[PDB]
RNA sequence: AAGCUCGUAUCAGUUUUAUGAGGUAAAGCGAAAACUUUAAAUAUGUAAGAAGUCCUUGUUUGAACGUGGACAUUUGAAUGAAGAGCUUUUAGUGGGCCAUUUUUGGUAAGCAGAACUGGCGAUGCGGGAUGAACCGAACGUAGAGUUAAGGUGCCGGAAUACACGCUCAUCAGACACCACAAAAGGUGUUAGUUCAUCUAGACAGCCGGACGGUGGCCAUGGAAGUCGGAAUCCGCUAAGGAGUGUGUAACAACUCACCGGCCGAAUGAACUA
RNA sequence: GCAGUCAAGCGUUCAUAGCGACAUUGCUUUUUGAUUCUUCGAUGUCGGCUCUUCCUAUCAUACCGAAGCAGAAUUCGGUAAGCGUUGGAUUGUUCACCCACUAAUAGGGAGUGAGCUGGGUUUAGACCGUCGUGAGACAGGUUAGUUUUACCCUACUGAU
């Protein structure tokens, strides 16, 4: 566009793009993990809290979780059998569809899947998921938790977020002088319905975390067997 | 009228102690051989200390296109000495012959840059031997397979001052 | 660069029908029908398989491509209005004097009416546009829900409604009273 | 963007 | 400044953390025509002889002027154009200070103008330099130094000058 | 003008040959392009033969004075021409405006002081709608014909010709515009130069992460990243900043720099015209 | 205005050969609204009575945005000339300011030097003070002093 083009943002944050060199570094690191560790895994985790990911990383000192862009991990595993870093290694790359989540480990293959079956943590609604539970906002004054907990311990919502309640959340909030209030007990979501993204934003602003989370796994490479296996659990 | 390509040659008036001075050659585009020799002397004066009095035209001949009927893309080196100092330029042209391509290039330069023929220089011209060597989109759009475009505004001429038919734009 | 041609697809819902002979356009659907005068825009519609239409602009400039893109946008808007419709909403609020908005059938035009705005004795009137149907929101205090097949009519009606009540000679920061848009969702809701 | 930049070098 | 920050005097301790050929600077100056610099004042019921001239430019009349009686008054140097001070600037240290004028030493272009005290963008003038703290070797503290005016007095009321170090 | 002592082979607002003449240097190899050799354009004087040239020798030998003898016409370079200058003595005029160069001095800006080349004065005619200067142009009376500047939509004689590109201006433009406002500003358009990313996913678009010592060290009814000062690391990451902004008394929360999730391919920045 | 500093750019080494936009430092009479009871040679006339017309660089009226605009009142900015923009004192002078009303008493061109008018282009009288031996004017001031349309033509307002 020679003219009348949209202006670019000029924000002056200290951070800068890592560039292709970071991708090459992750590629070399994945190759080192492939040539060092025997077993390999392709975890699927579309979203995870950063502290939860750190807690998963600290669960064992004997293993490493080289996260990266799915294309980078695929090229490290070989996009095709001719490009595979190791025999039959290309098959492990084919199974991945989601975020990964590669988990090289020297630990016994059974213990890893057992720990994954045991691990579980609370998580947000993660839209396109069925509603964990049905609830309705109190017809009286709104509170920071949304009334999920008894009002005597709850505190009124800060006024500063009220306009977002009218614009983003679509709730017909009325900002009464002293506190925000709604004339009627608006329902956040019915049980089992596919959540709208605005409904998930409302549940996040209210702090509800009824949904559970547990990383799934689809397959694990075995360098000793030189072949992928399709064991899976959720 | 139409531009005519020409080649020029010289040897700087051979003198004693320098038998057979080295020949030089430069393709030139001009309406006539006189202008071609003038541009050749003007180029030799810039690339060498020699002068028209110091040399002579060893030969002059027109260069007809080997395949004038054939369509050909033609990239062309260009530089114009205005308004600021001279700088390199490049343009693609789809023309049936190199001379018509040079004429369309001179017209596009005089239009989009107001450059005069005295300022324009043609450092090089070459055909695009193969597809996808083209870069700018305006030539690429004509390369599409089975391309077809209309001419909706066919404004027919009317020699008569009056027209009882109320002519249509058809098409 | 005087592109050799440009075009944009126009998806046709199976229940929609949109005859086009002249540049004037017409559309029909379960919710009704609509029409528009596009003769000025100089564009050529082209049906392919009755499920799509490809407007085209040969040898056009960048401004002509922008005209073609807005033509496709107006066509998609007319299709969404004849299929889904539109259901505008506008909350109103007051500080000390309650608002008394009410519909009236003066002169047969179904004039909108407002009273006691900020205590003013003037009775402002905002005539309803053709097609759009005013209706107060059910079980929702101090609200009105405009709706109409065309975005243009309902949008101009909401604009005139918010403009007729504009405050004057008073600081806006203290006087929050005045009608304001609340939502611009489709009549379906949820389909 | 000249197609034959390499040819001039030789 | 953001790109620079992202990539990243020898004074006494009492003085730190504080803040503020012999060619003349202007050997050449525009020649002032005699047709100007002398307004033709006219006087009497019949303005024929007019017997008078008046300077149209600033002049250092001196402390002891004591205006001449009007009957003998041919030349005139009106008080509004007079100045008792000049904005001399010292090239050393970058300092500039307003100081009283003392005397007009050498006016080029018919130094009879120097007898008239005219400055006219280049005339040298003595100035009281004692405020600058200058002290010549031997302990005889200086209190005067030459200075050359630069700005034209006619175009502004200030009388700037560069100190002759 | 009286004319007359000439039809005398003599002259020119010209070019060239030779010698200067100011020296930007770009070549050099010679002594060590480094220094002297060289050499280009920006405008300059002198000489270019017919009674013209050469040879011989008497003098205080260098030199010039003189006598005598020889060489005939491509006989002295190119182009043009019948014009030698004085003697007699006569009408009018002696600063008067303007265009480029060239050198001396100049400054808010104009410019001032000298030479030469040109128009007017004394000048018509065609065009710039007219004009002291602009362009064309050799003024007897007419016919035919061919042209310049300048034009070819009408006034206005001549194509609302051809072929290629830019222009929507809420008084553009046909303007002296290679001149003071003139330096840039316009998310108004078109064409180019340079620097970067990319199917191990280019820009934009929608969703999540944006972590822990930590509520870092100094002010204290209170600053937790964001009312006040000096640093701004480690730990793990794909990444995450003692924090780019919104907002609370603080918190909280929202959001962005950068990453990850989804479609997909060309995309972004600085300059020139 | 004078002296100085960084450089977005320019320019054969290269900004440090030279310049240089936008910024910036030191002075021009006191940091405690203290002072400022300074007002300093216009050699030349400008200023006023009736009255028409034009411009915006808009005081007010009309419509809007912003400003700690809660109100009132007020400031700036955008459009806007359609209509308004006053009655007087001061001549030991008036290139001026005051009070009072009004929404406001904004700035300019043709001005009207044969429409009339004071200051003035003021010749002939005189006096005071200066110069010059004198004649006279002059660094001054005062006083009193005849430039008198059209029926010609045209423009405009009426009328055959």
mmCIF file with all atom_site columns, N, CA and C (backbone and C1' of nucleotides) in Angstrom, chain A residues 6-7 11 13 15 18 20 23 47 49-50 54 64 67 69 71 205, chain F residues 187 198 200-201 204 208-211 235 237-240 247 253 257 260:
data_model
loop_
_atom_site.group_PDB
_atom_site.id
_atom_site.type_symbol
_atom_site.label_atom_id
_atom_site.label_alt_id
_atom_site.label_comp_id
_atom_site.label_asym_id
_atom_site.label_entity_id
_atom_site.label_seq_id
_atom_site.pdbx_PDB_ins_code
_atom_site.Cartn_x
_atom_site.Cartn_y
_atom_site.Cartn_z
_atom_site.occupancy
_atom_site.B_iso_or_equiv
_atom_site.pdbx_formal_charge
_atom_site.auth_seq_id
_atom_site.auth_comp_id
_atom_site.auth_asym_id
_atom_site.auth_atom_id
_atom_site.pdbx_PDB_model_num
ATOM 1   N N     . UNK A 1 6   ? -2.553  1.460   7.149  1.00 0.00 ? 6   UNK A N     1
ATOM 2   C CA    . UNK A 1 6   ? -2.733  1.504   8.594  1.00 0.00 ? 6   UNK A CA    1
ATOM 3   C C     . UNK A 1 6   ? -1.393  1.704   9.290  1.00 0.00 ? 6   UNK A C     1
ATOM 4   N N     . UNK A 1 7   ? -1.370  2.603   10.270 1.00 0.00 ? 7   UNK A N     1
ATOM 5   C CA    . UNK A 1 7   ? -0.160  2.829   11.048 1.00 0.00 ? 7   UNK A CA    1
ATOM 6   C C     . UNK A 1 7   ? 0.129   1.635   11.950 1.00 0.00 ? 7   UNK A C     1
ATOM 7   N N     . UNK A 1 11  ? 4.672   0.766   20.294 1.00 0.00 ? 11  UNK A N     1
ATOM 8   C CA    . UNK A 1 11  ? 4.898   0.540   21.715 1.00 0.00 ? 11  UNK A CA    1
ATOM 9   C C     . UNK A 1 11  ? 6.377   0.274   21.971 1.00 0.00 ? 11  UNK A C     1
ATOM 10  N N     . UNK A 1 13  ? 8.041   -1.367  24.496 1.00 0.00 ? 13  UNK A N     1
ATOM 11  C CA    . UNK A 1 13  ? 8.400   -2.399  25.459 1.00 0.00 ? 13  UNK A CA    1
ATOM 12  C C     . UNK A 1 13  ? 9.838   -2.852  25.238 1.00 0.00 ? 13  UNK A C     1
ATOM 13  N N     . UNK A 1 15  ? 11.084  -5.737  25.512 1.00 0.00 ? 15  UNK A N     1
ATOM 14  C CA    . UNK A 1 15  ? 11.201  -7.045  24.884 1.00 0.00 ? 15  UNK A CA    1
ATOM 15  C C     . UNK A 1 15  ? 11.234  -6.921  23.363 1.00 0.00 ? 15  UNK A C     1
ATOM 16  N N     . UNK A 1 18  ? 12.461  -12.979 19.497 1.00 0.00 ? 18  UNK A N     1
ATOM 17  C CA    . UNK A 1 18  ? 13.632  -13.845 19.597 1.00 0.00 ? 18  UNK A CA    1
ATOM 18  C C     . UNK A 1 18  ? 14.222  -14.162 18.228 1.00 0.00 ? 18  UNK A C     1
ATOM 19  N N     . UNK A 1 20  ? 14.478  -16.193 14.318 1.00 0.00 ? 20  UNK A N     1
ATOM 20  C CA    . UNK A 1 20  ? 14.656  -17.571 13.869 1.00 0.00 ? 20  UNK A CA    1
ATOM 21  C C     . UNK A 1 20  ? 15.714  -18.303 14.685 1.00 0.00 ? 20  UNK A C     1
ATOM 22  N N     . UNK A 1 23  ? 14.343  -20.518 17.245 1.00 0.00 ? 23  UNK A N     1
ATOM 23  C CA    . UNK A 1 23  ? 13.789  -21.743 16.681 1.00 0.00 ? 23  UNK A CA    1
ATOM 24  C C     . UNK A 1 23  ? 14.892  -22.738 16.349 1.00 0.00 ? 23  UNK A C     1
ATOM 25  N N     . UNK A 1 47  ? -4.066  -26.000 26.366 1.00 0.00 ? 47  UNK A N     1
ATOM 26  C CA    . UNK A 1 47  ? -3.806  -24.859 27.233 1.00 0.00 ? 47  UNK A CA    1
ATOM 27  C C     . UNK A 1 47  ? -3.484  -25.365 28.630 1.00 0.00 ? 47  UNK A C     1
ATOM 28  N N     . UNK A 1 49  ? -1.985  -23.634 32.637 1.00 0.00 ? 49  UNK A N     1
ATOM 29  C CA    . UNK A 1 49  ? -1.462  -22.523 33.418 1.00 0.00 ? 49  UNK A CA    1
ATOM 30  C C     . UNK A 1 49  ? 0.053   -22.634 33.531 1.00 0.00 ? 49  UNK A C     1
ATOM 31  N N     . UNK A 1 50  ? 0.732   -21.491 33.439 1.00 0.00 ? 50  UNK A N     1
ATOM 32  C CA    . UNK A 1 50  ? 2.190   -21.494 33.536 1.00 0.00 ? 50  UNK A CA    1
ATOM 33  C C     . UNK A 1 50  ? 2.683   -22.116 34.836 1.00 0.00 ? 50  UNK A C     1
ATOM 34  N N     . UNK A 1 54  ? 5.106   -25.428 35.218 1.00 0.00 ? 54  UNK A N     1
ATOM 35  C CA    . UNK A 1 54  ? 6.334   -25.503 36.002 1.00 0.00 ? 54  UNK A CA    1
ATOM 36  C C     . UNK A 1 54  ? 6.269   -26.639 37.016 1.00 0.00 ? 54  UNK A C     1
ATOM 37  N N     . UNK A 1 64  ? 12.951  -34.195 30.728 1.00 0.00 ? 64  UNK A N     1
ATOM 38  C CA    . UNK A 1 64  ? 12.866  -32.837 30.213 1.00 0.00 ? 64  UNK A CA    1
ATOM 39  C C     . UNK A 1 64  ? 11.652  -32.710 29.305 1.00 0.00 ? 64  UNK A C     1
ATOM 40  N N     . UNK A 1 67  ? 9.187   -27.956 25.103 1.00 0.00 ? 67  UNK A N     1
ATOM 41  C CA    . UNK A 1 67  ? 8.067   -27.358 24.396 1.00 0.00 ? 67  UNK A CA    1
ATOM 42  C C     . UNK A 1 67  ? 8.568   -26.515 23.225 1.00 0.00 ? 67  UNK A C     1
ATOM 43  N N     . UNK A 1 69  ? 7.125   -24.682 19.044 1.00 0.00 ? 69  UNK A N     1
ATOM 44  C CA    . UNK A 1 69  ? 6.147   -24.609 17.968 1.00 0.00 ? 69  UNK A CA    1
ATOM 45  C C     . UNK A 1 69  ? 5.974   -25.983 17.337 1.00 0.00 ? 69  UNK A C     1
ATOM 46  N N     . UNK A 1 71  ? 5.405   -26.957 14.369 1.00 0.00 ? 71  UNK A N     1
ATOM 47  C CA    . UNK A 1 71  ? 6.197   -27.173 13.163 1.00 0.00 ? 71  UNK A CA    1
ATOM 48  C C     . UNK A 1 71  ? 7.661   -27.424 13.502 1.00 0.00 ? 71  UNK A C     1
ATOM 49  N N     . UNK A 1 205 ? -13.889 -13.805 35.298 1.00 0.00 ? 205 UNK A N     1
ATOM 50  C CA    . UNK A 1 205 ? -13.976 -12.610 36.127 1.00 0.00 ? 205 UNK A CA    1
ATOM 51  C C     . UNK A 1 205 ? -14.583 -12.920 37.487 1.00 0.00 ? 205 UNK A C     1
ATOM 52  P P     . U   F 2 187 ? -0.411  11.320  6.633  1.00 0.00 ? 187 U   F P     1
ATOM 53  O "O5'" . U   F 2 187 ? -1.227  9.989   6.314  1.00 0.00 ? 187 U   F "O5'" 1
ATOM 54  C "C5'" . U   F 2 187 ? -1.315  9.492   4.983  1.00 0.00 ? 187 U   F "C5'" 1
ATOM 55  C "C4'" . U   F 2 187 ? -2.575  8.691   4.762  1.00 0.00 ? 187 U   F "C4'" 1
ATOM 56  C "C3'" . U   F 2 187 ? -3.884  9.450   4.991  1.00 0.00 ? 187 U   F "C3'" 1
ATOM 57  O "O3'" . U   F 2 187 ? -4.868  9.008   4.057  1.00 0.00 ? 187 U   F "O3'" 1
ATOM 58  C "C1'" . U   F 2 187 ? -3.797  7.579   6.428  1.00 0.00 ? 187 U   F "C1'" 1
ATOM 59  P P     . C   F 2 198 ? 12.569  -16.255 8.680  1.00 0.00 ? 198 C   F P     1
ATOM 60  O "O5'" . C   F 2 198 ? 11.416  -16.938 7.821  1.00 0.00 ? 198 C   F "O5'" 1
ATOM 61  C "C5'" . C   F 2 198 ? 10.194  -17.326 8.430  1.00 0.00 ? 198 C   F "C5'" 1
ATOM 62  C "C4'" . C   F 2 198 ? 9.082   -17.440 7.419  1.00 0.00 ? 198 C   F "C4'" 1
ATOM 63  C "C3'" . C   F 2 198 ? 9.331   -18.384 6.255  1.00 0.00 ? 198 C   F "C3'" 1
ATOM 64  O "O3'" . C   F 2 198 ? 9.093   -19.740 6.590  1.00 0.00 ? 198 C   F "O3'" 1
ATOM 65  C "C1'" . C   F 2 198 ? 8.447   -16.340 5.450  1.00 0.00 ? 198 C   F "C1'" 1
ATOM 66  P P     . A   F 2 200 ? 7.534   -26.524 6.263  1.00 0.00 ? 200 A   F P     1
ATOM 67  O "O5'" . A   F 2 200 ? 8.821   -25.741 6.784  1.00 0.00 ? 200 A   F "O5'" 1
ATOM 68  C "C5'" . A   F 2 200 ? 8.723   -24.766 7.812  1.00 0.00 ? 200 A   F "C5'" 1
ATOM 69  C "C4'" . A   F 2 200 ? 9.153   -25.321 9.148  1.00 0.00 ? 200 A   F "C4'" 1
ATOM 70  C "C3'" . A   F 2 200 ? 9.447   -24.303 10.239 1.00 0.00 ? 200 A   F "C3'" 1
ATOM 71  O "O3'" . A   F 2 200 ? 8.280   -23.815 10.875 1.00 0.00 ? 200 A   F "O3'" 1
ATOM 72  C "C1'" . A   F 2 200 ? 11.159  -25.938 10.192 1.00 0.00 ? 200 A   F "C1'" 1
ATOM 73  P P     . G   F 2 201 ? 8.202   -22.283 11.351 1.00 0.00 ? 201 G   F P     1
ATOM 74  O "O5'" . G   F 2 201 ? 7.995   -21.479 9.993  1.00 0.00 ? 201 G   F "O5'" 1
ATOM 75  C "C5'" . G   F 2 201 ? 7.099   -21.963 9.000  1.00 0.00 ? 201 G   F "C5'" 1
ATOM 76  C "C4'" . G   F 2 201 ? 6.177   -20.881 8.497  1.00 0.00 ? 201 G   F "C4'" 1
ATOM 77  C "C3'" . G   F 2 201 ? 5.812   -19.802 9.524  1.00 0.00 ? 201 G   F "C3'" 1
ATOM 78  O "O3'" . G   F 2 201 ? 5.679   -18.533 8.882  1.00 0.00 ? 201 G   F "O3'" 1
ATOM 79  C "C1'" . G   F 2 201 ? 3.852   -20.829 8.743  1.00 0.00 ? 201 G   F "C1'" 1
ATOM 80  P P     . A   F 2 204 ? 0.851   -7.881  12.530 1.00 0.00 ? 204 A   F P     1
ATOM 81  O "O5'" . A   F 2 204 ? -0.671  -7.874  12.051 1.00 0.00 ? 204 A   F "O5'" 1
ATOM 82  C "C5'" . A   F 2 204 ? -1.338  -6.655  11.757 1.00 0.00 ? 204 A   F "C5'" 1
ATOM 83  C "C4'" . A   F 2 204 ? -2.640  -6.887  11.028 1.00 0.00 ? 204 A   F "C4'" 1
ATOM 84  C "C3'" . A   F 2 204 ? -3.757  -7.546  11.827 1.00 0.00 ? 204 A   F "C3'" 1
ATOM 85  O "O3'" . A   F 2 204 ? -4.457  -6.655  12.677 1.00 0.00 ? 204 A   F "O3'" 1
ATOM 86  C "C1'" . A   F 2 204 ? -3.549  -8.642  9.761  1.00 0.00 ? 204 A   F "C1'" 1
ATOM 87  P P     . G   F 2 208 ? -9.201  -15.691 26.201 1.00 0.00 ? 208 G   F P     1
ATOM 88  O "O5'" . G   F 2 208 ? -7.951  -16.657 26.417 1.00 0.00 ? 208 G   F "O5'" 1
ATOM 89  C "C5'" . G   F 2 208 ? -8.086  -17.887 27.115 1.00 0.00 ? 208 G   F "C5'" 1
ATOM 90  C "C4'" . G   F 2 208 ? -6.778  -18.636 27.189 1.00 0.00 ? 208 G   F "C4'" 1
ATOM 91  C "C3'" . G   F 2 208 ? -5.680  -17.994 28.025 1.00 0.00 ? 208 G   F "C3'" 1
ATOM 92  O "O3'" . G   F 2 208 ? -5.814  -18.246 29.414 1.00 0.00 ? 208 G   F "O3'" 1
ATOM 93  C "C1'" . G   F 2 208 ? -4.788  -18.667 25.946 1.00 0.00 ? 208 G   F "C1'" 1
ATOM 94  P P     . G   F 2 209 ? -5.005  -17.354 30.478 1.00 0.00 ? 209 G   F P     1
ATOM 95  O "O5'" . G   F 2 209 ? -3.472  -17.621 30.132 1.00 0.00 ? 209 G   F "O5'" 1
ATOM 96  C "C5'" . G   F 2 209 ? -2.830  -18.824 30.530 1.00 0.00 ? 209 G   F "C5'" 1
ATOM 97  C "C4'" . G   F 2 209 ? -1.352  -18.795 30.224 1.00 0.00 ? 209 G   F "C4'" 1
ATOM 98  C "C3'" . G   F 2 209 ? -0.555  -17.685 30.889 1.00 0.00 ? 209 G   F "C3'" 1
ATOM 99  O "O3'" . G   F 2 209 ? -0.193  -18.003 32.222 1.00 0.00 ? 209 G   F "O3'" 1
ATOM 100 C "C1'" . G   F 2 209 ? 0.041   -17.845 28.595 1.00 0.00 ? 209 G   F "C1'" 1
ATOM 101 P P     . A   F 2 210 ? -0.151  -16.864 33.353 1.00 0.00 ? 210 A   F P     1
ATOM 102 O "O5'" . A   F 2 210 ? 0.842   -15.768 32.762 1.00 0.00 ? 210 A   F "O5'" 1
ATOM 103 C "C5'" . A   F 2 210 ? 2.208   -16.071 32.507 1.00 0.00 ? 210 A   F "C5'" 1
ATOM 104 C "C4'" . A   F 2 210 ? 2.890   -14.931 31.795 1.00 0.00 ? 210 A   F "C4'" 1
ATOM 105 C "C3'" . A   F 2 210 ? 2.662   -13.551 32.396 1.00 0.00 ? 210 A   F "C3'" 1
ATOM 106 O "O3'" . A   F 2 210 ? 3.532   -13.274 33.482 1.00 0.00 ? 210 A   F "O3'" 1
ATOM 107 C "C1'" . A   F 2 210 ? 2.264   -13.466 30.070 1.00 0.00 ? 210 A   F "C1'" 1
ATOM 108 P P     . C   F 2 211 ? 2.961   -13.122 34.979 1.00 0.00 ? 211 C   F P     1
ATOM 109 O "O5'" . C   F 2 211 ? 3.433   -14.457 35.712 1.00 0.00 ? 211 C   F "O5'" 1
ATOM 110 C "C5'" . C   F 2 211 ? 2.511   -15.499 35.995 1.00 0.00 ? 211 C   F "C5'" 1
ATOM 111 C "C4'" . C   F 2 211 ? 3.212   -16.816 36.226 1.00 0.00 ? 211 C   F "C4'" 1
ATOM 112 C "C3'" . C   F 2 211 ? 4.085   -16.898 37.471 1.00 0.00 ? 211 C   F "C3'" 1
ATOM 113 O "O3'" . C   F 2 211 ? 3.350   -17.157 38.657 1.00 0.00 ? 211 C   F "O3'" 1
ATOM 114 C "C1'" . C   F 2 211 ? 5.298   -17.714 35.622 1.00 0.00 ? 211 C   F "C1'" 1
ATOM 115 P P     . G   F 2 235 ? 20.195  -18.899 36.330 1.00 0.00 ? 235 G   F P     1
ATOM 116 O "O5'" . G   F 2 235 ? 18.817  -19.418 36.938 1.00 0.00 ? 235 G   F "O5'" 1
ATOM 117 C "C5'" . G   F 2 235 ? 18.776  -20.064 38.201 1.00 0.00 ? 235 G   F "C5'" 1
ATOM 118 C "C4'" . G   F 2 235 ? 17.388  -20.556 38.527 1.00 0.00 ? 235 G   F "C4'" 1
ATOM 119 C "C3'" . G   F 2 235 ? 16.621  -21.183 37.374 1.00 0.00 ? 235 G   F "C3'" 1
ATOM 120 O "O3'" . G   F 2 235 ? 16.982  -22.536 37.159 1.00 0.00 ? 235 G   F "O3'" 1
ATOM 121 C "C1'" . G   F 2 235 ? 15.218  -19.674 38.554 1.00 0.00 ? 235 G   F "C1'" 1
ATOM 122 P P     . U   F 2 237 ? 13.783  -25.366 31.276 1.00 0.00 ? 237 U   F P     1
ATOM 123 O "O5'" . U   F 2 237 ? 12.285  -25.201 30.765 1.00 0.00 ? 237 U   F "O5'" 1
ATOM 124 C "C5'" . U   F 2 237 ? 12.010  -24.915 29.403 1.00 0.00 ? 237 U   F "C5'" 1
ATOM 125 C "C4'" . U   F 2 237 ? 10.860  -23.951 29.267 1.00 0.00 ? 237 U   F "C4'" 1
ATOM 126 C "C3'" . U   F 2 237 ? 10.784  -23.196 27.950 1.00 0.00 ? 237 U   F "C3'" 1
ATOM 127 O "O3'" . U   F 2 237 ? 10.198  -23.955 26.905 1.00 0.00 ? 237 U   F "O3'" 1
ATOM 128 C "C1'" . U   F 2 237 ? 10.558  -21.670 29.728 1.00 0.00 ? 237 U   F "C1'" 1
ATOM 129 P P     . A   F 2 238 ? 11.083  -24.428 25.647 1.00 0.00 ? 238 A   F P     1
ATOM 130 O "O5'" . A   F 2 238 ? 10.221  -23.977 24.384 1.00 0.00 ? 238 A   F "O5'" 1
ATOM 131 C "C5'" . A   F 2 238 ? 10.827  -23.349 23.263 1.00 0.00 ? 238 A   F "C5'" 1
ATOM 132 C "C4'" . A   F 2 238 ? 10.359  -21.924 23.131 1.00 0.00 ? 238 A   F "C4'" 1
ATOM 133 C "C3'" . A   F 2 238 ? 10.553  -21.074 24.381 1.00 0.00 ? 238 A   F "C3'" 1
ATOM 134 O "O3'" . A   F 2 238 ? 11.827  -20.450 24.402 1.00 0.00 ? 238 A   F "O3'" 1
ATOM 135 C "C1'" . A   F 2 238 ? 8.296   -20.943 23.680 1.00 0.00 ? 238 A   F "C1'" 1
ATOM 136 P P     . A   F 2 239 ? 12.409  -19.796 25.748 1.00 0.00 ? 239 A   F P     1
ATOM 137 O "O5'" . A   F 2 239 ? 11.487  -18.518 25.978 1.00 0.00 ? 239 A   F "O5'" 1
ATOM 138 C "C5'" . A   F 2 239 ? 11.516  -17.437 25.059 1.00 0.00 ? 239 A   F "C5'" 1
ATOM 139 C "C4'" . A   F 2 239 ? 10.298  -16.559 25.194 1.00 0.00 ? 239 A   F "C4'" 1
ATOM 140 C "C3'" . A   F 2 239 ? 10.103  -15.902 26.549 1.00 0.00 ? 239 A   F "C3'" 1
ATOM 141 O "O3'" . A   F 2 239 ? 10.914  -14.753 26.719 1.00 0.00 ? 239 A   F "O3'" 1
ATOM 142 C "C1'" . A   F 2 239 ? 8.056   -16.835 25.827 1.00 0.00 ? 239 A   F "C1'" 1
ATOM 143 P P     . G   F 2 240 ? 11.917  -14.640 27.969 1.00 0.00 ? 240 G   F P     1
ATOM 144 O "O5'" . G   F 2 240 ? 11.125  -13.718 28.996 1.00 0.00 ? 240 G   F "O5'" 1
ATOM 145 C "C5'" . G   F 2 240 ? 10.605  -12.465 28.584 1.00 0.00 ? 240 G   F "C5'" 1
ATOM 146 C "C4'" . G   F 2 240 ? 9.234   -12.218 29.156 1.00 0.00 ? 240 G   F "C4'" 1
ATOM 147 C "C3'" . G   F 2 240 ? 9.109   -12.334 30.664 1.00 0.00 ? 240 G   F "C3'" 1
ATOM 148 O "O3'" . G   F 2 240 ? 9.582   -11.187 31.348 1.00 0.00 ? 240 G   F "O3'" 1
ATOM 149 C "C1'" . G   F 2 240 ? 7.280   -13.425 29.612 1.00 0.00 ? 240 G   F "C1'" 1
ATOM 150 P P     . G   F 2 247 ? -7.899  5.683   34.021 1.00 0.00 ? 247 G   F P     1
ATOM 151 O "O5'" . G   F 2 247 ? -8.228  4.549   35.091 1.00 0.00 ? 247 G   F "O5'" 1
ATOM 152 C "C5'" . G   F 2 247 ? -9.467  3.854   35.064 1.00 0.00 ? 247 G   F "C5'" 1
ATOM 153 C "C4'" . G   F 2 247 ? -9.599  2.925   36.244 1.00 0.00 ? 247 G   F "C4'" 1
ATOM 154 C "C3'" . G   F 2 247 ? -9.263  3.526   37.600 1.00 0.00 ? 247 G   F "C3'" 1
ATOM 155 O "O3'" . G   F 2 247 ? -10.340 4.260   38.155 1.00 0.00 ? 247 G   F "O3'" 1
ATOM 156 C "C1'" . G   F 2 247 ? -8.162  1.447   37.367 1.00 0.00 ? 247 G   F "C1'" 1
ATOM 157 P P     . A   F 2 253 ? -5.861  -10.674 39.821 1.00 0.00 ? 253 A   F P     1
ATOM 158 O "O5'" . A   F 2 253 ? -6.804  -9.919  38.780 1.00 0.00 ? 253 A   F "O5'" 1
ATOM 159 C "C5'" . A   F 2 253 ? -8.201  -10.162 38.760 1.00 0.00 ? 253 A   F "C5'" 1
ATOM 160 C "C4'" . A   F 2 253 ? -8.944  -9.099  37.989 1.00 0.00 ? 253 A   F "C4'" 1
ATOM 161 C "C3'" . A   F 2 253 ? -8.544  -8.918  36.534 1.00 0.00 ? 253 A   F "C3'" 1
ATOM 162 O "O3'" . A   F 2 253 ? -9.095  -9.893  35.666 1.00 0.00 ? 253 A   F "O3'" 1
ATOM 163 C "C1'" . A   F 2 253 ? -8.670  -6.808  37.564 1.00 0.00 ? 253 A   F "C1'" 1
ATOM 164 P P     . A   F 2 257 ? 1.920   -4.035  21.897 1.00 0.00 ? 257 A   F P     1
ATOM 165 O "O5'" . A   F 2 257 ? 3.207   -4.758  22.509 1.00 0.00 ? 257 A   F "O5'" 1
ATOM 166 C "C5'" . A   F 2 257 ? 4.473   -4.114  22.473 1.00 0.00 ? 257 A   F "C5'" 1
ATOM 167 C "C4'" . A   F 2 257 ? 5.633   -5.043  22.762 1.00 0.00 ? 257 A   F "C4'" 1
ATOM 168 C "C3'" . A   F 2 257 ? 5.716   -6.347  21.986 1.00 0.00 ? 257 A   F "C3'" 1
ATOM 169 O "O3'" . A   F 2 257 ? 6.162   -6.185  20.652 1.00 0.00 ? 257 A   F "O3'" 1
ATOM 170 C "C1'" . A   F 2 257 ? 6.299   -6.716  24.253 1.00 0.00 ? 257 A   F "C1'" 1
ATOM 171 P P     . G   F 2 260 ? 5.451   -19.468 18.588 1.00 0.00 ? 260 G   F P     1
ATOM 172 O "O5'" . G   F 2 260 ? 4.249   -20.394 19.070 1.00 0.00 ? 260 G   F "O5'" 1
ATOM 173 C "C5'" . G   F 2 260 ? 4.497   -21.524 19.892 1.00 0.00 ? 260 G   F "C5'" 1
ATOM 174 C "C4'" . G   F 2 260 ? 3.310   -21.860 20.756 1.00 0.00 ? 260 G   F "C4'" 1
ATOM 175 C "C3'" . G   F 2 260 ? 1.989   -22.073 20.036 1.00 0.00 ? 260 G   F "C3'" 1
ATOM 176 O "O3'" . G   F 2 260 ? 1.878   -23.342 19.416 1.00 0.00 ? 260 G   F "O3'" 1
ATOM 177 C "C1'" . G   F 2 260 ? 1.636   -20.676 21.896 1.00 0.00 ? 260 G   F "C1'" 1
#
